[PDB]
Design an enzyme around this catalytic site. Structure first.
Site, short mmCIF file in Angstrom:
data_model
loop_
_atom_site.label_atom_id
_atom_site.label_comp_id
_atom_site.label_asym_id
_atom_site.label_seq_id
_atom_site.Cartn_x
_atom_site.Cartn_y
_atom_site.Cartn_z
N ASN A 67 44.40 13.63 32.72
CA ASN A 67 45.31 14.33 33.58
C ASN A 67 46.11 15.51 32.95
O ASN A 67 46.17 15.39 31.73
CB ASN A 67 46.36 13.27 33.96
CG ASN A 67 45.93 11.87 35.08
OD1 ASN A 67 44.96 12.09 35.59
ND2 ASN A 67 46.23 10.88 34.40
N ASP A 68 46.61 16.45 33.68
CA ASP A 68 47.25 17.47 33.19
C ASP A 68 48.60 17.19 32.73
O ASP A 68 49.01 17.51 31.56
CB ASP A 68 47.35 18.51 34.23
CG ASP A 68 46.57 19.74 34.20
OD1 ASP A 68 45.27 19.47 33.56
OD2 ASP A 68 46.75 20.84 34.46
N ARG A 102 34.79 51.70 55.05
CA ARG A 102 36.11 51.79 56.01
C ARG A 102 37.12 52.90 55.29
O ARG A 102 38.34 52.87 55.64
CB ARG A 102 36.88 50.31 55.69
CG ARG A 102 37.25 50.32 54.35
CD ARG A 102 38.16 48.70 54.27
NE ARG A 102 38.42 48.52 52.73
CZ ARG A 102 37.59 48.34 51.67
NH1 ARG A 102 36.28 48.36 51.62
NH2 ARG A 102 38.13 48.28 50.52
N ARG A 153 32.19 44.53 51.58
CA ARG A 153 33.49 43.97 52.06
C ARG A 153 33.28 43.47 53.37
O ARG A 153 34.29 42.62 53.92
CB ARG A 153 34.60 44.89 51.89
CG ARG A 153 35.38 44.94 50.13
CD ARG A 153 34.09 45.20 49.27
NE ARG A 153 34.62 45.60 48.09
CZ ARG A 153 33.92 45.56 46.65
NH1 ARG A 153 32.75 44.99 46.76
NH2 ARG A 153 34.60 45.94 45.61
N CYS A 160 42.32 20.16 33.52
CA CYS A 160 41.25 19.04 33.56
C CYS A 160 40.50 19.11 34.52
O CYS A 160 39.29 18.66 34.21
CB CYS A 160 42.12 17.71 33.40
SG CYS A 160 43.37 17.41 32.29
N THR A 161 40.72 19.32 35.71
CA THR A 161 39.60 19.64 36.70
C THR A 161 38.75 20.75 36.40
O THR A 161 37.39 20.52 36.61
CB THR A 161 40.27 20.14 38.16
OG1 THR A 161 41.07 19.01 38.56
CG2 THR A 161 39.11 20.36 39.22
N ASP A 203 46.95 47.49 46.90
CA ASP A 203 46.34 46.45 47.03
C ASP A 203 46.43 45.24 46.19
O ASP A 203 45.62 44.49 45.77
CB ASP A 203 44.72 46.96 46.92
CG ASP A 203 44.14 47.35 45.67
OD1 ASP A 203 45.07 47.49 44.89
OD2 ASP A 203 42.95 47.38 45.58
N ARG A 215 38.09 21.66 33.34
CA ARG A 215 37.69 21.62 31.98
C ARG A 215 36.42 20.39 31.98
O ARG A 215 35.31 20.35 31.31
CB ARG A 215 38.57 21.27 30.92
CG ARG A 215 38.04 20.86 29.52
CD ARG A 215 38.98 20.20 28.71
NE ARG A 215 40.30 21.18 28.78
CZ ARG A 215 41.55 20.72 29.13
NH1 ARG A 215 41.68 19.82 29.84
NH2 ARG A 215 42.61 21.58 29.03
#
Ligand SMILES: Nc1ncnc2c1ncn2[C@@H]1O[C@H](COP(=O)(O)OP(=O)(O)OP(=O)(O)O)[C@@H](O)[C@H]1O
Ligand SMILES: [Cl-]
Ligand SMILES: [K+]
Ligand SMILES: [Mg+2]
Ligand SMILES: [Mg+2]
Ligand SMILES: [Mg+2]
EC number: 6.2.1.45
Length: 1005
Positions: free
Chosen positions: A769-770, A472, A12, A591-592, A535, A594
């Protein structure tokens, strides 16, 4: 050992600092002068961070009062040398960091053994000047820090020559460009913001037509709005055609520091609080005056709350102003009230102030070692005077603040005895026992919080200790790995302060809906306040809602690398954590992911999903089909991806492997499918030279035309895709067969396979396009073609006892092939689309959603929380007294603001608090009477009564059911067990006939 970093420990922190900075740290020898609380806190953080060695100098004998903030001293150590008794406990923090003791500093030339020297408040100003002159003239980095009650400062002098290699620690900005004109005007693609500032530098890649502009040359940026910038003339490089990606580059910055002696008369300030700008110069004179006071008086500081000494300090500051005219400037008078408080508190030793400066100063040490981040240049002063209780309730005078011969004398010195007793008797819930939780429990031990007969601490955390935590979470040791965090932390701090023995109830329960029988009404109602050390948003929001319900104050905080924040939530006064949250980060278009990836983030997301489908969901869906006689029927009711679910079952059972060779063949065939055939299918549908409706190239901008892969077992990503895929499949099907795979073995299997040739499906539509419809939805399948797939499934009777073992994703076990697979799979797809490949550590960061973390920020933020905690103890109702904090140690930057007041509303003519108010109803009222009573006394035409998600009533038959019966009805006939109160949420109309927002209801059963 040179060049090696233990990623399993430093994971980390590596995401904060980077490998290069840690390699420089591992060559640096640090010396800390003075091991009271400030020194030990600094040393703790630096030793955790991993430097070459830590050497501590403090020959002074332990006195009981030193234990106020020195968490590694014990009453049995009194009379022994602080340095000697602290060395062994620091050494246990990090076995990679030797910890030595320097016996004597009479010979100043010993400092030449060290790269960074830190002078705490045990070092007189006379000695600080001599040491700084020797360090500065020798090329040794020098840092000093002092705390005085609720005040403190730090000074940084890294010498005549120091180079900053990375000023911010932020990921370099990048972006796609659509034009670069001859004058250097760069236009961003579509709506993409560059995110740059004037004076940044960038390089370029993929800029066709400008050839050598892509060779790594840097260009200085002139911003032209958020979607364009200018780099100067590019005529010498050619003429832009198409394409391009800019990448920001951080350039080195040489800076120079003045000596301490020079800075005493002409300081350069970094401010900690813009509401207190004018206090820095005042405190600069005051901290100096305190040293002059001590040389006058046999080395003693002003007496606690002593007005004679305070008047003497004021005269010292006045004289110093005349000697140092540039400090205050012309016409500025001494702030005598401020200097008075400094005198009154000079001997104070406050845990939250020590933690704040311990974290800040340790980070400055790491900057000094590495060139990473921007050093403080050069003085910073701080105060938290708002922490003082109202004197009407807790008067401060020489009587109340006098020592009582205890470890708390130098907190009593500031707050008085009665206030410290109220801390001791406080009742607090700490939620979480990780980084912030450990630091929190340490602070509370030092405060003696919960040590009083009527006080107590409850801390809960369901997690166990893992190795990377140790960097930490300093209450834990290698031997503690696998044990429960809360239980080990509680034991650790009671060793630091046995006053807390028996007062810390360490629980291992997860906080949330499923444990309200444990954390019941009596549990919450008994508490004074709550502190979050969590967290995730779900847990934080849940605790926030409980604190609102029970009207308990909540102390919230968080870190992200060098950044941190604190938030104070006060009943009937402020916004809550939930209402202040920011809308979620927009997701990646499907679409990006896939079809048109253009960043490694896209290929990693895709690979993680493929990992999940291949090795988790596929196995589960099989087991359910074999186990639940109604699975197929259910799968059309529940649906979602009927086609995908049924196909995975059929695939999983028809191609089952019989040995490990079968798993290799399977993985090689998936390689062909995902990185060759599917890519040829995409290019079939969208040829490389295809045009859109408007005649522009289809493959432009964010759409990068891919190339199919030809499997090459000497490509590391191809090889490890098959290795990891085969091993995870062998796991799925209980096949057994090496941590080191043998390339020649794998190669012999694959070399003898016949690889099916690609044949395109010419009747597919791929979503561009979506906004466009989805060709691959349940609606796009058809109610007729699923029958074939169903009847072709083998009946469970033919597979008696057959079971598949699903994988549970575990980012932190480097032997389990999970990150190996995701990294290889991601990188093969990156190769398809000409995206730069990423290593396992970066893939683990993204796919595992790891949060960068470091002890410096954790300790500092925790200190700030405990300075607000003081204000809860005094029941402060003036919102202006509280401080929400933001910190960025990279810069370093500190910002504080008063919390935001709760929004107020009106169901007309009645004023209410939209967060904290509610209607309290006695008894299990019948539904009709509740609807009535809202008309009667609240004048509300209730239109929607909801319990959780479901609507128990809606105006869009009729019930006289007591609420407890009504809830039973609509929640599949379940009986509430331990419930004494019930929360209901209303939509309503007002007497004017208009819909109004209204507060929630509590039913008291
Ligand atoms: N609902 C919950 N109830 C109790 N504790 C929780 C809950 N959700 C999270 N936590 C705890 O909050 C703590 C957060 O601490 P931190 O994130 O420093 O440690 P971590 O999650 O183990 O470390 P890393 O994120 O580096 O793996 C964890 O110990 C975690 O178990
Ligand atoms: Cl790239
Ligand atoms: K087609
Ligand atoms: Mg301009
Ligand atoms: Mg964990
Ligand atoms: Mg965590």
């Amino acid at each position: 050992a040179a060049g090696e970093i233990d990623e399993s420990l430093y994971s980390r922190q590596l995401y904060v600092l980077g490998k290069e900075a840690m390699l420089k740290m591992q060559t640096s020898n640090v010396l800390i002068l003075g091991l009271k609380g400030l020194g030990v806190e600094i040393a703790k953080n630096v030793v955790l961070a991993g430097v070459k060695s830590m050497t501590v100098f403090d020959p002074e004998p332990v006195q009981l009062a030193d234990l106020s903030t020195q968490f590694f001293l014990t009453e049995k150590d009194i009379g022994q040398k602080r340095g000697d008794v602290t060395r062994a406990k620091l050494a246990e923090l990090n076995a990679y960091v030797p910890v030595n003791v320097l016996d004597s500093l009479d010979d100043v030339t010993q400092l030449s053994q060290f790269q960074v020297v830190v002078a705490t408040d045990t070092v007189s100003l006379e000695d600080k000047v001599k040491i700084n002159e020797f360090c500065h003239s020798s090329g040794i980095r020098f840092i000093s820090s002092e705390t005085r009650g609720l005040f403190g400062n730090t000074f940084v002098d890294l010498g005549d020559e120091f180079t900053v290699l990375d000023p911010t620690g932020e990921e370099p900005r990048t972006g796609m460009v659509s034009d670069i004109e001859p004058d250097g005007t760069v236009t961003m693609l579509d709506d993409n913001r560059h995110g740059l500032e004037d004076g940044n530098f960038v390089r370029f890649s993929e800029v066709e037509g400008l050839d050598k502009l892509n060779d790594g040359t840097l260009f200085k940026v002139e911003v032209l709005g958020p979607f364009a910038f200018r780099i100067g003339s590019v005529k010498e490089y050619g003429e832009y055609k198409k394409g391009g990606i800019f990448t920001e580059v951080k350039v080195p910055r040489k800076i120079s520091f003045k000596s301490l002696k020079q800075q005493l008369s002409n300081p350069e300030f970094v401010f900690s609080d813009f509401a207190k700008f004018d206090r820095a110069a005042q405190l600069h004179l005051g901290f100096q005056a305190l040293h002059q006071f001590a040389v006058r008086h046999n080395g003693e500081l002003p007496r606690t709350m002593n007005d004679e000494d305070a008047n003497e300090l004021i005269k010292l500051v006045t004289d110093l102003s005349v000697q140092q005219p540039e400090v205050l400037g012309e016409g500025v008078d001494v702030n005598e009230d401020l200097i008075k408080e400094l005198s009154y508190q000079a001997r104070g030793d406050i845990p939250g102030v020590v933690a704040f400066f311990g974290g800040l100063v340790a980070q400055e040490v790491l900057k000094a070692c590495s060139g990473k981040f921007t050093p403080l240049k050069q003085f910073m002063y701080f105060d938290s005077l708002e922490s003082l209780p109202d004197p009407k309730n807790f008067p401060r005078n020489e009587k109340t603040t006098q020592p009582v011969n205890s470890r708390y004398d130098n907190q009593i010195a500031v707050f008085g005895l009665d206030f410290q007793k109220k801390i001791a008797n406080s009742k607090v819930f700490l939620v979480g026992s990780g980084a912030i939780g450990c630091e929190m429990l340490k602070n509370w031990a030092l405060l003696g919080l919960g040590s009083g007969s009527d006080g107590y601490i409850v801390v809960t955390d369901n997690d166990s200790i893992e190795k990377s935590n140790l960097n930490r979470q300093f209450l834990f040791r290698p031997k503690d790995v696998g044990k429960n965090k809360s239980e080990v932390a509680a034991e650790a701090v009671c060793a630091m302060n046995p006053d807390l023995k028996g007062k810390i109830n360490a629980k291992i329960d997860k906080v949330g809906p499923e444990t309200e029988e444990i954390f019941n009404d009596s549990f919450w109602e008994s508490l004074d306040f709550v502190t979050n050390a969590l967290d995730n948003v779900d847990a934080r929001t849940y605790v926030d809602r409980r604190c609102v319900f029970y009207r308990k104050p909540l102390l919230e905080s968080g870190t992200l690398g060098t950044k941190g924040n604190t938030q104070v939530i006060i009943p009937r006064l402020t916004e809550s954590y939930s209402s202040s949250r920011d809308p979620p980060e927009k997701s990646i278009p499907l679409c990006t992911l896939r079809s048109f990836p253009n960043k490694i983030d896209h290929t990693i997301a895709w690979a993680k999903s493929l990992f999940q489908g291949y090795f988790t969901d596929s196995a589960e869906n099989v087991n359910m089909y074999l186990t639940q006689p109604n699975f197929v029927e259910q799968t059309l009711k529940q649906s979602g991806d009927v086609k995908g679910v049924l196909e995975s079952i059929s695939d999983s059972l028809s191609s089952k492997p019989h040995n490990f060779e079968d798993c290799i063949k399977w993985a090689r065939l998936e390689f062909e499918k995902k990185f060759n055939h599917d890519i040829k299918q995409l290019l079939f549908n969208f040829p490389k030279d295809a045009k859109t409706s408007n005649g522009e190239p289809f493959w432009s901008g964010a759409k990068r035309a891919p190339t199919p892969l030809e499997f090459d077992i000497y490509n590391n990503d191809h090889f490890h895709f098959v290795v990891a895929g085969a091993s995870l499949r062998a796991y799925n099907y209980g096949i057994k067969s090496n941590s080191k795979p043998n390339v020649d073995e794998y190669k012999s299997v694959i070399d003898h396979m016949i690889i099916p040739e690609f044949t395109p499906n010419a009747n597919l539509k791929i979503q561009v396009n979506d906004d466009d419809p989805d060709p691959n939805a349940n609606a796009a399948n058809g109610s007729d073609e699923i029958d074939q797939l169903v009847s072709s499934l083998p009946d469970p009777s033919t597979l008696a006892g057959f079971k598949l073992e699903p994988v549970d994703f575990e980012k932190d076990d480097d032997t389990n092939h999970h990150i190996e697979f995701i990294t290889a799979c991601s990188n093969c797809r990156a190769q398809n689309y000409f995206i730069e490949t990423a290593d396992r550590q970066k893939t683990k960061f993204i796919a595992g959603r790891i949060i960068p973390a470091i002890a410096t920020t954790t300790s500092l933020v925790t200190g700030l929380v405990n300075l607000e905690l003081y204000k809860l103890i005094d029941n402060k109702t003036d919102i202006e007294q509280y401080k929400n904090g933001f910190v960025n140690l990279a810069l370093p930057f500190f910002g504080f603001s008063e919390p935001i007041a709760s929004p107020k509303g009106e169901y007309n003519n009645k004023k209410y608090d939209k967060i904290w108010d509610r209607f309290d109803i006695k008894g299990d009222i019948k539904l009709s009477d509740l609807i009535e009573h809202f008309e009667k006394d609240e004048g509300l035409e209730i239109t929607m009564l909801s319990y959780g998600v479901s609507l128990l009533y809606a105006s869009f038959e009729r019930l006289n059911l007591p609420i407890t019966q009504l809830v039973k009805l609509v929640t599949k006939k379940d009986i509430p067990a331990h419930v004494s109160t019930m929360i209901l949420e209303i939509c309503a109309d007002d007497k004017e006939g208009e819909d109004v927002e209204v507060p929630f209801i509590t039913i008291h059963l």
